[PDB]
Amino acid sequence: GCFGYKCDYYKGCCSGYVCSPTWKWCVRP
C-alpha cells in the first residue's frame, strides 16, 4: 500500500487506502 501518502481530491490513495479527512494522508478504513 501507501500509508502516509499525502492525499487530496486529485491525489487519491492506493487501493487498500482512503484519504483521512482529519490528517490528509492515506489510512486503512
From Swiss-Prot:
Belongs to the neurotoxin 10 (Hwtx-1) family. 51 (Hntx-8) subfamily. Hntx-8 sub-subfamily. It comes from Cyriopagopus schmidti. The lineage of its organism: Eukaryota, Metazoa, Ecdysozoa, Arthropoda, Chelicerata. It is found in: Secreted. Disulfide bonds join C2-C14, C7-C19, C13-C26. Coiled coil: none annotated. Expressed by the venom gland. The presence of a 'disulfide through disulfide knot' structurally defines this protein as a knottin. Weakly inhibits 5HT3A receptors and Kv1.3/KCNA3 voltage-gated potassium channels. Agglutinates erythrocytes. This is U5-theraphotoxin-Hs1b 1.
